[PDB]
Curated annotation (Swiss-Prot), chain A:
The gene is Nos1. It comes from Rattus norvegicus (Rat). (6R)-L-erythro-5,6,7,8-tetrahydrobiopterin binds at residues 36, 370-371, 384. This is Nitric oxide synthase 1. Produces nitric oxide (NO) which is a messenger molecule with diverse functions throughout the body. In the brain and peripheral nervous system, NO displays many properties of a neurotransmitter. Inhibitory transmitter for non-adrenergic and non-cholinergic nerves in the colorectum. Probably has nitrosylase activity and mediates cysteine S-nitrosylation of cytoplasmic target proteins such SRR. Inhibitory transmitter for non-adrenergic and non-cholinergic nerves in the colorectum. It comes from the Eukaryota. The chain holds residues 299 to 718 of 1429 of the full protein. Changing residue 281 to F: No decrease in nitric-oxide synthase activity.
Length: 411, 407
């Protein structure tokens, strides 16, 4: 079975066979496409096959499929499962799994980098204090004084779902949001609810516009504990504009390290519920979404005001003009401070090269167009005209519900 | 069974039930989403007729009435005897409006009920077709105050007597491959232009030559006609701030009129059904002007603005893109030719979608096409979950005639 994707700018046509290895489901049917829906404990029984497909993939990749070492490993894992209802990954398999979850992440435009990922094995961690230490080391290593390096830290896997390791923060580094009695927000509206939890847990909120949130860390199903990342580890960039001298007086900054900390890494049926991972930013994540979403910092008006754009009619494209200037500012600031960042032209062009290479070497590259296309200037990037096939491969990153909704408080 | 869509900007949640009345297939499966793919008998006909007439009589609040049963009976008798049937004028108008209403990729559907339907089912020759089309064009243009219109030529019979407009739009510019190696005019139309030349068209070989119509009646060989130039309203493109802009020699036509699609109503197939509205600015300024495989003007404009084109990260493409789109909108507005910007159009669509949810139980929408090709996330549609499904009546793609036609 073969599936073809066309690029409508280049007429380049690719053939996907990889989708035949797809296990998980999409949410779509022959009658309904759910392609724009944001969010569409295992038995021994289900675990054996999952482990086996994983180990088959792993041993093929090292050109050892069907070897004695492959067979012995299957036998050993099977025995471990029947006897203990679960199993332990070798370090090599963990590394491979983590790299593959990234490689398989169809919503990630940054996948050209998938094979350079530093894996920190934190499966010997037992306490929230232990977690804090691992996370500090990850932050320092990944930050690398502005010369960012991709990394993931992997905490112990789920057992009975009652002893989960979780990082309650959605990202390791994020700014607090405070709902004011007059209904306005100070700082980042995205993080109001989590900020409230931190405050309730005893965090002394400075109540500024750019307060780095404390880490809220849960080990072994215990109640989460608050920790402050050492400020000297939190690299930040003041935002200025190359031509507009008043831009700095907007008082904007952002942090350099994007580190997603609330997803679940699934490898060979095992579930790693705390697996913070980090890379570097594409400029639009900050300049389009973080700054210009109406539900976020929402700075478009103020920027357009200072530029004295005609704001009486939308058809002046004042929003669009301000949007570009903000995004220029973000890239210029990160570059000037030597903090790794990639523009959306460069990221999408690299992604297209990655995608074609993946088709050639792997038989496919699952990709979610809705997410891959940048949130500004969509059609002047090469991904816009690229047909993509979206399907779900394992290993994978998955969403999980926010822990404050599910946690059984011990007291 | 009942499906929820969330807006991530406003937290508003809508419940879709309309998808259960879905009847065509999406191309997707539980294993693979094809969301981003551009183009994924008597016995068959009666269910299709019944389905349609049920929705029609329901709409005029006469479901299960004698007039309903009688028409169902009438159409059935017509099919068994003739192997097809004819729509009443009222049914035709209902069907056409609903094909638009159901167009999941159309952002402008708030307008769906205000569609002027021209019944050209009495047409028999390519000459008749040309007359009907000039009239549509003049009506729709309305000296710049544009009005939505569709013109419906006779339905398919045995498939050997198809009416087709060979053009993809009623008004488009020619494309010519040059000894130079580059393309003159619109590169999207090079194959069609050559077909026009090989049919006898005297091509002026300019950058903006309005293509002639190539009309096929009753399955006959297609004939050429030039639309009266006085009926083709065009707009010279200037910028409100940059005086050099006009020097690029850019213009575009006022009337977007898609002419190559197939209208399907109650199993009947209208293979020639040109329809028109008015432009959203980005269609011209982003796609027509800036696509690499179209007029591809970004480099020239960036140059004139004296932007630093050394590095992608200066966002010179993005800067030029915005300016090109300001010029488009400015030029149309100044010349009083109806146009909508992507902010206004997407805001309207959100309002339409909420109307459709509360009055119909849903609104099929294809996010990939609805989100504008520039500034996506600063339009409300970006943050709106949409369910995409296929309802009938509908507009469908069909193979280009030069592949299908037997000469
Ligand atoms: C190296 C630099 C990277 C860049 C520039 C990059 C870029 C991006 C961007 C722009 C998004 C969409 C984000 C949004 O709109 O919220 C994304 C999504 C994602 N990335 Fe990356 N990425 C990078 C590295 C990584 C790494 C190291 C991992 C994991 C090891 C990763 C896994 C993911 C996943 C799982 C998603 C989508 C989440 C979902 O399914 O909703 N990426 N990437
Ligand atoms: C009146 C103002 C209208 C506006 C502003 C508008 C807007 C648009 C836009 C921007 C597109 C995307 C086109 C592209 O990217 O190539 C589109 C698609 C489409 N529109 Fe409209 N439209 C209008 C009127 C109409 C009318 C009158 C009809 C039919 C009666 C129609 C039916 C369609 C269909 C079928 C598609 C998508 C074709 C496909 O499936 O690929 N629209 N619309
Ligand atoms: C359910 C849901 C709701 C919502 N509003 N947002 C999300 C997105 C969460 C997420 C996942 C992966 C990457 C990023 C964006 C952050 C990021 C991470 C890395 C590793 C690199 C990079 N350039 N950027 N953000 C999910
Ligand atoms: C074969 C094929 C290939 C391809 N790459 N794209 C297409 C799209 C055809 C099409 C359909 C509807 C509207 C428009 C865009 C033109 C248009 C039409 C109307 C009625 C209003 C408006 N504002 N704009 N264009 C077809
Ligand atoms: C591959 C992808 O489906 C293709 O580029 C689409 C994307 N979205 C689009 N959206 C609109 N409105 N019009 C288009 O022509 C396209 N092209
Ligand atoms: C409704 C829609 O799926 C949602 O707004 C998506 C669209 N595309 C996106 N793309 C990226 N990269 N990030 C996002 O948060 C979103 N949001
Ligand atoms: Zn789908």
């Amino acid at each position: 079975r073969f599936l073809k994707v066309k690029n409508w700018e280049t007429d380049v046509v690719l053939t996907d066979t990889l989708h035949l290895k797809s296990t998980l489901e999409t949410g779509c049917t022959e009658h309904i496409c759910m392609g724009s829906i944001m969010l569409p404990v295992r038995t021994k029984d289900q675990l054996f096959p999952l482990a086996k497909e994983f180990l088959d993939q792993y041993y093929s990749s090292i050109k050892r499929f069907g070897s004695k070492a492959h067979m012995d490993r299957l036998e050993e894992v099977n025995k471990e499962i029947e006897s203990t209802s679960t199993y332990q990954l070798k370090d090599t398999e963990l590394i491979y799994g983590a790299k593959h979850a990234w490689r398989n992440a169809s919503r990630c435009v940054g996948r050209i980098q998938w094979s350079k990922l530093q894996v920190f094995d934190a499966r010997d961690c037992t306490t929230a204090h232990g977690m804090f230490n691992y996370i500090c080391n990850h932050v320092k290593y990944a930050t690398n004084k502005g010369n960012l390096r991709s990394a993931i830290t992997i905490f112990p896997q789920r057992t009975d779902g009652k002893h989960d390791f979780r990082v309650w923060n959605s990202q390791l580094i994020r700014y607090a949001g405070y709902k004011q009695p007059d209904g306005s927000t100070l700082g980042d509206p995205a993080n109001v609810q989590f900020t409230e939890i931190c405050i309730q847990q005893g965090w002394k909120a400075p109540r500024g516009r750019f307060d780095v949130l404390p880490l809220l860390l849960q080990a072994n199903g215990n109640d989460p504990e608050l920790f402050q990342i050492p400020p000297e580890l939190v690299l930040e960039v003041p935002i200025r504009h190359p031509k507009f001298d008043w831009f700095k007086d907007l008082g904007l900054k952002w942090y350099g390290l994007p580190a997603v900390s609330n997803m679940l890494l699934e490898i060979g049926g095992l579930e790693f519920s705390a697996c913070p991972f980090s890379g570097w930013y594409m400029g639009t994540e900050i300049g389009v979404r973080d700054y210009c979403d109406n539900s976020r910092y929402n700075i478009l008006e103020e920027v357009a005001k200072k530029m004295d754009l005609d704001m009486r009619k939308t058809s002046s494209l004042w929003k669009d003009q301000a949007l570009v200037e903000i995004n220029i500012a973000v890239l210029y600031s990160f570059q000037s401070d030597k903090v790794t960042i990639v523009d959306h032209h460069s990221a999408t062009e690299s992604f297209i090269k990655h995608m074609e290479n993946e088709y050639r070497c792997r038989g496919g590259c699952p990709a979610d167009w809705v997410w891959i296309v940048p949130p500004m200037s969509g059609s002047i990037t090469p991904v816009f005209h690229q047909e993509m096939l979206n399907y779900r491969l394992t290993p994978s990153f998955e969403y999980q519900p926010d822990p404050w909704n599910t946690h059984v408080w011990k007291g």
